[PDB]
Nucleic acid binder design. Structure first.
Lengths: 58, 618, 1340
RNA sequence: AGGUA
């Protein structure tokens, strides 16, 4: 409840007491898949397709 | 508020359009590097090129997946390092200064792997970056796609940008240490080992110097083969004896074939070396110019190190008349103050007279100091003493123009003279001491005002220059060369400029690189020496100088009939080449940068009574 | 004479002996907070002032008043050390005595009942440390003193903007200490206007109308009456012969019955003197002269009361006839001279639309608040509270004293609220200045700018807190019971404490202490800021304030300020300057009697300085204060000039008083350019502490003072004999004459070792003393960071040669020998902090464990069974320190992932790895582990181990103290027991704890034995209670923010060595970056063979004007030559006599040196101690402007058997061939700045993107890319750079799809791009559409 | 916030 009682803060507030940079300028996007993982997924898809091609038809 | 921003739109351009595949680090000198390359630390190279490393590792099959390649590169095994060398070998990288004032603020270089953590920058290029190695940080960008790699190699490359975009004279000019080395190597003494010798080739000169059988500078007759570009562009080998010095012959060894020997047979300051590079580029081309610039850098550094040029405490010799001049000027200002109490002279006139007296005293002190330092050497040639250029080191850096001008040395060895107080008024009593005779408390407190004013002026002028160059870029944004030629006989009447009473900018410099708008006749006979509208290179300027025509009509961009752009001719030639501008070049942006970048350098009787012509003419 | 000085005597130059020892450099902060917190028996600065100002609080109906008695500071629950360890503030509870009094209900006042609340807790105030700092969140913060315009009246000149009229104007601003500003300004129409704050100007007479003044009253108070007697024809007037100045004869000037000056003539001083000597009483004047005059007051008929004249109209024939026929005889007109009091107030009254108090109040109420129908009561309340409410308007003592000073009153005190007389005086002064009689006052004179130190700012903020809690109390006194209720239940500590914490923690003037040097700390605590709340915003320049004013001399260091866009705003306070009683800057001056310069001092303020003439510190005095020049250089009115030696009134106390500590520490500052000296002083604060911090050879004498006065050095509070030496503890047996009555025992100094500073630099203290050394008060027991032998030792002294070397030192670059890294010098220790928080998420509480799913066993190796790395384990980038794991939520699987899990038989893990890895790029040893688990949450093994460690440490300390004390107790027990019958045979062989079992016959000895047995029991109880009290602190957990179950802090110590890329500099301002570390052989070497450690570009000297570095280099040769000679003597070990003679000659060598000579030291031990301390060179002290001359340096060089010119020919390392002409070599003090290249790299190809935009940036482990701003876009556009520009814009910046496709293509080995669209532009389109604006993309 | 160019 004590955690809930506090209100969210703006990103427009400066981080570090009036540095010309804002808080939101540092927030990392966690909903974006890393290109490393995307390349891994592409390679895995290619490998699985090749392996399935290595098996029989049915 | 999210749309409206400064400077410009935030997310789009500034602030700030962050970019991937980039690094940043402190820069150091790269005195072994070639001009077309720069030192890049191994760690930054590895981190920057991780996708390339993965690609090549999977290509040669040392890793079966991207994840395995990632494990290999984070383990930093010796295997990935050869891959890294391979990917770096041809890939050029862009080096960027923290502030970018003109297009030379970003230049391509071939990265060279170095153990360490700082980017090694070519010493010749730091002048363009306006970067001094005092903690300046530069950024590195990686042009990814093949088109971008090629684009960087063709345009971004340092060797392709040896000339400033604001003026044809080279921007990669030897600056301070190399200039000092060249000057010491070419400056002649009055007596030294091995004078009067006869030598064939500069190779014997280098042999004699390195063996210690002669001195670096000594009057010697040497047989040298100078090559002259003549006839149709063919080398003319002329072998004869020149009276020169050993250091000059050693330098001539470096100079590529095709230049007159007279260019090096002289004391070489900053101006001399810059002119020599300009002549080399105009006569030979690009590749000889780059090779010669690199070789002259190496030679200058080597012979500066061998020079042992050092600034001591004795190489600011105080002029002997400093006390006498100071005491005299004190006497006259005391007399003027006494007369002011008598009411004979007004306060303003008294102040002006005191200021003039102190200015005269300062000039006398500076002249005496310069006479003392300039010809300090009095050594005899064979027994007869003679007055010639001093071996004094501070006089070498003053004369060669490496660092420190006459005004600079004036505050060191003479007296630093008048300055100003708040309200910007010149102080009645100047500083009678210099930095070799330590300033007392009060005079230092006085100098503090000048220091504060200078620093605040630099800050405010930098901000104002940034705003100005932004506005220039805005107005000149959309302008681009869209046509090779439009066809127009309009233009501007072009003359050497004379403001006041004397010419300060001749016709040739203002017309060099311009296109003719009218076939101007000779000042005498009505003969056309300049054909229909054509680019004016150095040969045409020389022809115009020989037959001195008062005015030339020149196709200006303003009179160009092209719409949605300008024709190539109406612009000129200036870029990084002596050839006409290429269609598609954005002249607006280069012009805006050219006018904006020097903005940080901007910190600002017989007249109307009787006209006195200084020379004899009609 | 200090034994610390005995251990190393720095050779001090300087021909003028100082008469005033360097003040305690932190006196400003300490005195400020002492004034803030100490009790005051009267109304004085601090909490007492705020309380007495706000209390008593009167209830809005109820007769229930709250009265203040006193305040008491509770002892802090945690000391400084545990406050830093636990991350909690170091603060003292504030408890206040209050009484609620209820009077007669309801009748006239008079107490009926009263109740007292004792020591009510209304918040905790941060308590000041002994180093002059505050600990707030485990970080040591500093409150920078603020320079702000003093309360009072400023009569400023308005220039540069003239309302298209010229004639620059004047304006008087009344600036209150608290309240609303007042402005009286002029217009180019010679009218006066009043502005409350900065609202619309009103005609100036309105304020007087609101002050209940009639027009005639105003005219009487401002203008001078002129008497006109109605006699003869058309009146005569009573002429004062002194009144006529600068007037033309428009009226016959008669005297003694005849006219002297006829009409039309020019009146000069001759006619004026004739009139004065003739004493003209009255003159007949023509009516034409009358017609331009103005009547002062009203005039009605004397027989019928008909109004015929009123106040302030021009005179005319008809009005004169009416007043003559009415019966008047005396007419009082206004004296209006264009050089004397001009037509300002008259025309202002003409402009005035109001004529009464009510309309003035209406106008004021409407200008202050637009519209707002002017209720009479509301307007009256507004006017009264604007300037006459003590709780809404206050000038304070400083404001009142300045107010009376500018109006030239002998009073220096009075009511804070303004009075009508004060306002009228301000108007009169402003009008006189407009007439040219008065003079304007600068807003840059240090007399007009006051310094608010920490105490005053804290008191003001506490006053604001008291104001808001006063609002709460006044609401409660009517909302709550109007009868007896306990007052602790109606006082709210939350607002006051919260606001105080906001001030101390998050403010423009509360900064992390720049803690990488003792000098840095001293400068930060001495810093003076023109910014902050109530000061100047950075929207300035505004050259005036940034510029150095002539009053700064000796008060503010002129040559120390940042070069950023705050230059001349962040100053540093001078060495000798101190804050005046009223908050202004005062500097000491030696009082000068006409003939003799006395040694007594007076601290002169800024305004007082201008009155007298002050002699320069460079004046040469022989004997008892006698000048050697008849005309000596001095400064009287801000202008330097020669004055005869019989008019001087004061002299500068020392030659170093015109600079700050940072500037004063630079040697040969007199030989350096002010710009480059400024740069050097700024950089000197950025020096990183060095592992081998030896000393500067060429010092200035402030090294010892800076080291001692800063808190980093452990200084012996009470002298005695060193009883115990340890790297962590120093125990001193205090001298007999310095111990308190009874058993005071020992003094223990725990040495702070390897603790993280605010710059992530190690700060440790090493013991510089040994067993049995006699020490006295003020001695340096332990040398802190960048400090050795009590001297400030930021950088290191190194052999440097000024020469170009193959261009490696090209711009300002430094070339460094491999010997430097081999000697492990300039090798710094960086202690960085890492925090792993185990939180409580809604997916499940996080936990710390050794077993991490799907990780290598190497990671598990370095952790204990508790999941925490062992203390002392070596870790590198990427290694796991804390085994945090987070309860994994629902998992989505791609078809390929499902196929693979079906194949391998594996399934998704229920918990995801969240372990804290070391950020890549850093290494080092885990030196300390802190575990914080909040109370009520189960402890883990590692926390128990750490608590046991600290518990046993405290137990060991207590046991040592107790055993020493009880050993003394048992010794005196034996002494008592042996007396009164010999009992020393058996007792001596018995254990000391069995010495209380021996009885004795009834006597004073027996009573003493019983008392000492009781003392032993009391000591046992004291030990037990101390152990219990500290065990309560140790055992209890830390109450963290809600959500975090545990916190694990790990300290990484990186022994970061010097390498190419690191920024290195000198004290004089010479800068640079180390280019390449060459092998030791490549260094140029002298004839003896010593290779030079550092090579500097000499071309940086003659253009930076900093010749002082050359003199420092030469003096370094001199010092190191003396050191080499003494080292050769020590290796030869000649004798005590030879070494003593050589050292005495070295100290003697100079001219009029104040060094003082030996023998005053010990014969043998001290001589060898000095020799061993000087074998590395004799440190030399060069005062800032009383420094050594070239002749003295050359003499000292001759003593060192070194070339007089200071240049030695060096043989190259590569070729072994000597350079032509000698080269300058010498030992220069060089500094490694906190700009290490290791911190300066960041490089990325993939990583942190952003939410709203896709610009890559973020992360303290791997940062974003480099901002390709509009400048670089222009640079690319300048070339034909198109594809590279597109890469800069879309592929690598913001096009997420294009970015992924590029990464895949590069991995696959293909080089081409999708142009796509940057996500930033799509954001722009959507955001424009968010307005009422359509924007679209249209095809052709 | 401080510092760097």
């Amino acid at each position: 409840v004590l955690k809930i009682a506090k209100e969210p803060i703006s990103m427009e507030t400066p981080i570090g007491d009036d540095e010309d940079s804002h808080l939101g300028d540092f927030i990392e996007d966690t909903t974006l898949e890393l290109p490393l993982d995307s390349a891994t997924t592409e390679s895995l898809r290619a490998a699985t397709h090749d392996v399935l091609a290595g098996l029989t038809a049915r | 508020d999210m749309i409206k921003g400064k400077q410009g739109r935030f997310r789009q351009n500034l602030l700030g359009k962050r970019v991937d595949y980039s690094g940043r680090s402190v820069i150091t000198v790269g005195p072994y590097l070639r001009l077309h390359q720069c030192g890049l630390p191994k760690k930054m190279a590895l981190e920057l090129f991780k996708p390339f490393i993965y690609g090549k590792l999977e290509l040669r099959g040392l890793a079966t997946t991207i994840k395995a390649a990632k494990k290999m590169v984070e383990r930093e095994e010796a295997v990935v390092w050869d891959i890294l060398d391979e990917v770096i070998r041809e890939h050029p990288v862009l080096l960027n200064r923290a502030p970018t004032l003109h297009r030379l603020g970003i230049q391509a270089f071939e990265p060279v792997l170095i153990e360490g953590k700082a980017i090694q920058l070519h010493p010749l290029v730091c002048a363009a970056y306006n970067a001094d190695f005092d903690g300046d940080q530069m950024a590195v960008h990686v042009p990814l796609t093949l088109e971008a790699q090629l684009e960087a190699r063709a345009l971004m490359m340092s060797t392709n940008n040896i000339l400033s975009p604001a003026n044809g004279e080279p921007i990669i000019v030897p600056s301070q240490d190399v200039v000092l080395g060249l000057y010491y190597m070419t400056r002649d003494c009055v007596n030294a080992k091995g004078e009067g010798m006869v030598l064939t080739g500069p190779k014997e000169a280098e042999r004699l110097y390195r063996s210690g059988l002669a001195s670096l500078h000594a009057r010697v007759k040497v047989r040298i083969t100078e090559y002259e570009k003549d006839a149709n562009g063919e080398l003319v080998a002329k072998t004869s004896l020149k009276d020169t010095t050993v250091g000059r012959a050693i330098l001539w060894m470096i100079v590529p074939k095709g230049l007159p020997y007279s260019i090096v047979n002289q004391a070489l300051g900053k101006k001399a070396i810059s002119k020599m590079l300009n002549t080399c580029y105009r006569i030979l081309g690009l590749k000889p110019t780059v090779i010669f610039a690199d070789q002259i850098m190496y030679t200058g550094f080597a012979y500066a190190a061998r020079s042992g040029a050092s600034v001591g405490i004795d190489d600011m010799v105080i002029p002997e008349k400093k006390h006498e001049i100071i005491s005299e000027a004190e006497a006259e200002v005391a007399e003027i103050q006494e007369q002011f109490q008598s009411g004979l002279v007004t306060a303003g006139e008294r102040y002006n007279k005191v200021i003039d007296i102190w200015a005269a005293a300062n000039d006398r002190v500076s002249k005496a100091m310069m006479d003392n330092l300039q010809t300090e050497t009095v050594i005899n040639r064979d027994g007869q003493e003679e007055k010639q250029v001093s071996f004094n080191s501070i006089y070498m850096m003053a004369d060669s123009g490496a660092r420190g001008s006459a005004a600079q040395i004036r505050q060191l060895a003479g007296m630093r003279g008048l300055m100003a107080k708040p309200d910007g008024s010149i102080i009645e009593t100047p500083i009678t001491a210099n930095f070799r005779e330590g300033l007392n408390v009060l005079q230092y407190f006085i100098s503090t005002h000048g220091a504060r004013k200078g620093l605040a002026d630099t800050a405010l002028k930098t901000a104002n220059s940034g705003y100005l160059t932004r506005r220039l870029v805005d107005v000149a944004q959309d302008l681009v060369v869209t046509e090779d030629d439009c066809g127009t006989h309009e233009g501007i009447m072009m003359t050497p400029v004379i403001e006041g009473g004397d010419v300060k900018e001749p016709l040739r410099d203002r017309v060099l690189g311009r296109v003719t708008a009218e076939d101007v006749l000779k000042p005498g006979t009505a003969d056309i020496l300049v054909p229909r509208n054509t680019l004016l290179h150095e040969q045409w300027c020389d022809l115009l100088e020989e037959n001195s025509v008062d005015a030339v009509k020149v196709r200006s961009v303003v009179s160009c009939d092209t719409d949605f752009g300008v024709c190539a001719h109406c612009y000129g030639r200036d870029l990084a080449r002596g050839h006409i501008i290429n269609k598609g070049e954005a002249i607006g942006v280069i012009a805006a940068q050219s006018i904006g970048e020097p903005g940080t350098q901007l910190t600002m009787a017989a007249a109307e009574s009787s006209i006195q012509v200084k020379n004899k003419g009609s | 004479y200090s034994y610390t000085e005995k251990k190393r005597i720095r050779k001090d130059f300087g021909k003028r002996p100082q008469v005033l020892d360097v003040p305690y450099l932190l006196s400003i902060q300490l005195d400020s907070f002492q004034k803030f917190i100490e009790q005051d028996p009267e109304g004085q600065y601090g909490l007492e002032a705020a309380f007495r100002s706000v209390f008593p609080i009167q209830s809005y109906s109820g007769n229930s008043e709250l009265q203040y008695v006193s305040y008491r500071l509770g002892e802090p629950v945690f000391d400084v050390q545990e406050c830093q360890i636990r991350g909690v503030t170091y603060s003292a509870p504030l408890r206040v005595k209050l009484r609620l009094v209820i009077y007669e209900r309801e009748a006239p006042e008079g107490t009926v009942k009263d109740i007292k609340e004792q020591e009510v807790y209304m918040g905790e105030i941060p308590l000041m440390t002994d180093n002059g700092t505050f600990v707030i969140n485990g970080t040591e913060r500093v409150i920078v003193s603020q320079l702000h315009r003093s309360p009072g009246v400023f009569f400023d000149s308005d220039k540069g903007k003239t309302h298209s009229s010229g004639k620059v104007l004047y304006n008087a601003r009344i600036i209150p200490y608290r309240g609303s500003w007042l402005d009286f300004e002029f217009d180019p129409k010679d009218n006066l206007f009043v502005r409350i704050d900065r609202r619309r100007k009103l005609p100036a007479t309105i304020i007087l109308r609101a002050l209940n003044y009639t027009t005639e009253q105003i005219l009487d108070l401002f203008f001078e009456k002129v008497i006109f007697e109605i006699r003869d024809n058309k009146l005569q007037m009573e002429l004062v012969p002194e009144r006529l100045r600068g007037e033309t004869a428009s009226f016959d000037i008669e005297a003694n019955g005849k006219v002297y000056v006829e009409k039309g003539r020019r009146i000069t001083a001759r006619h004026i003197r004739q009139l004065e000597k003739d004493d003209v009483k009255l003159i007949e004047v023509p009516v034409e002269y009358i017609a331009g005059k103005v009547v002062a007051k009203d005039y009605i008929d004397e027989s019928t009361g008909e109004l015929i004249c009123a106040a302030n109209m021009e005179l005319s024939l008809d009005l004169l006839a009416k007043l003559s026929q009415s019966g008047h005889k005396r007419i009082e007109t206004l004296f209006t001279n264009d050089l004397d009091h001009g037509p300002y107030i008259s025309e202002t009254l003409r402009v005035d639309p109001t004529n009464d108090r009510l309309s003035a109040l209406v106008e004021i109420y409407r200008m202050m608040r637009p519209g707002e129908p002017p209720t009479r009561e509301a307007a009256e309340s507004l006017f009264e509270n604007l300037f006459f409410s003590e709780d809404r308007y206050d000038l304070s003592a400083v404001g009142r004293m300045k107010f009376n000073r500018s109006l030239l009153r002998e009073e220096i005190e009075g009511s804070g609220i303004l009075s009508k007389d004060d306002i009228i005086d301000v108007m009169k002064k402003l009008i006189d200045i407009r007439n040219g009689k008065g003079e304007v006052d600068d807003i840059d004179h240090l007399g007009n700018r006051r310094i608010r130190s920490v105490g005053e700012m804290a008191e003001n903020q506490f006053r604001v807190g008291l104001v808001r809690v006063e609002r709460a109390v006044k609401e409660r006194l009517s909302l709550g019971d109007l009868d007896t209720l306990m007052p602790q239940d109606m006082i709210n500590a939350k607002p006051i404490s919260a606001a105080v914490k906001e001030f101390f923690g998050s403010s423009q003037l509360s900064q992390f202490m720049d803690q990488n040097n003792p000098l840095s700390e001293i400068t930060h605590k001495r810093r003076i800021s023109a910014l902050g709340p109530g000061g100047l915003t950075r929207e300035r320049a505004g050259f005036e304030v940034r510029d150095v004013h002539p009053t700064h001399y000796g008060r503010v260091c002129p040559i120390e300020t940042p070069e950023g866009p705050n230059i001349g705003l962040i100053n540093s306070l001078s060495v000798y300057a101190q804050t005046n009683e009223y908050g202004f800057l005062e500097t000491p001056y030696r009082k000068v009697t006409d003939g003799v310069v006395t040694d007594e001092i007076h601290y002169l303020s800024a305004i007082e300085e201008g009155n007298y003439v002050i002699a320069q510190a460079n004046s040469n005095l022989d004997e008892e204060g006698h000048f050697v020049e008849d005309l000596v250089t001095c400064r009287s009115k801000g202008e330097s000039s020669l004055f005869s030696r019989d008019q001087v009134d004061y002299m500068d106390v020392s030659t170093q008083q015109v600079v700050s500590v940072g500037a004063s520490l630079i040697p040969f500052l007199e030989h350096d350019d002010a710009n480059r000296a400024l740069m050097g002083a700024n950089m000197q604060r950025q020096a990183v502490p060095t592992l081998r911090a030896d000393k500067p050879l060429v010092g200035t004498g402030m090294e010892r003072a800076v080291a001692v006065d800063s808190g980093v050095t452990a200084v012996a509070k009470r002298g005695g004999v060193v009883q115990y030496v340890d790297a962590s503890r120093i125990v001193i047996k205090v001298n007999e004459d310095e111990m308190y009555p009874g058993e005071a025992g020992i003094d223990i100094y725990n040495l702070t070792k390897y603790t993280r500073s605010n710059q992530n630099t190690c700060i440790n203290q090493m013991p510089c003393v040994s067993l049995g050394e006699p020490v006295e008060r003020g001695d340096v027991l332990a040398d802190g960071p960048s400090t050795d032998l009590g001297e400030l030792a930021l950088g290191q002294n190194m052999r440097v040669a000024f020469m170009p070397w193959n261009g490696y030192n090209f711009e300002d670059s430094i070339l460094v020998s491999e010997r430097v890294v081999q000697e492990d010098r300039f090798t710094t220790i960086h202690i960085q902090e890492l925090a792993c928080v185990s939180r409580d998420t809604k997916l499940g509480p996080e936990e710390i464990t050794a077993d991490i799913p799907n990780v290598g066993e190497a990671a598990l190796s370095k952790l204990d069974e508790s999941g925490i790395v062992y203390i002392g384990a070596e870790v590198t980038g990427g290694d796991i320190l804390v085994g945090k794991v987070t309860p994994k939520g629902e998992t989505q699987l791609t078809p390929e992932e499902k196929l693979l899990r079906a194949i391998f038989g594996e399934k998704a893990s229920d918990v995801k790895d969240s372990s804290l890895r070391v950020p890549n790029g850093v290494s080092g040893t885990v030196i300390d582990v802190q575990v914080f688990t909040r109370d009520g949450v189960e402890k883990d093994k590692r926390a128990l181990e750490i608590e046991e460690m600290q518990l046993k440490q405290a137990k060991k300390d207590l046991s040592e103290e107790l055993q020493i004390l009880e050993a003394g107790l048992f010794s005196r027990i034996r002494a008592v027991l042996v007396a009164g019958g010999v009992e020393a045979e058996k007792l001596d062989k018995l254990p000391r704890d069995r010495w209380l079992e021996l009885g004795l016959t009834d006597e004073e000895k027996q009573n003493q034995l019983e008392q000492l047995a009781e003392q032993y029991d009391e000591l046992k109880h004291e030990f037990e209670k101390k152990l219990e009290a500290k065990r309560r602190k140790i055992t209890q957990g830390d109450d963290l923010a809600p959500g975090v179950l545990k916190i694990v802090k790990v300290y990484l110590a990186v022994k970061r060595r010097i390498q190419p890329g690191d920024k290195m500099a000198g004290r004089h301002g010479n800068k640079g970056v180390i280019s390449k570390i060459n092998p030791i052989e490549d260094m140029p070497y002298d004839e003896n063979g010593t290779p030079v450690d550092i090579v500097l570009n000499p071309l940086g000297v003659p253009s930076r004007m900093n010749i002082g570095q050359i003199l420092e280099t030469h003096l370094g040769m001199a010092a190191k030559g003396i050191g080499d000679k003494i080292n050769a003597m020590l290796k030869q070990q000649q004798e005590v006599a030879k070494l003593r003679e050589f050292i005495q000659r070295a100290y003697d060598l100079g001219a009029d040196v104040r060094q003082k000579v030996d023998l005053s030291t010990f014969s043998d031990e001290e001589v060898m101690r000095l020799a061993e301390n000087l074998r590395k060179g004799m440190p030399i002290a060069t005062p800032v402007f009383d420094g050594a001359k070239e002749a003295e340096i050359k003499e000292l060089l001759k003593l060192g058997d070194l070339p007089t010119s200071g240049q030695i020919r060096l043989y190259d390392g590569r070729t072994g061939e000597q350079f032509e002409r000698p080269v300058t070599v010498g030992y220069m003090y060089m500094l490694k700045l906190n700009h290490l290249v290791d911190d300066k790299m960041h490089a990325r190809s993939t990583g942190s993107y952003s939410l709203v935009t896709q610009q890559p940036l973020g992360g303290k482990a791997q940062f974003g890319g480099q901002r390709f701003g509009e400048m670089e876009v222009w640079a690319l556009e300048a070339y034909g750079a198109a594809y590279t520009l597109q890469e800069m814009l879309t592929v690598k910046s913001d096009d997420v799809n294009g970015r992924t496709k590029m990464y895949k293509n590069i991995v696959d080995g293909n080089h081409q791009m999708e142009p796509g669209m940057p996500e930033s532009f799509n954001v722009l389109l959507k955001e424009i559409r968010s307005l009422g604006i359509n924007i679209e993309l249209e095809d052709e």
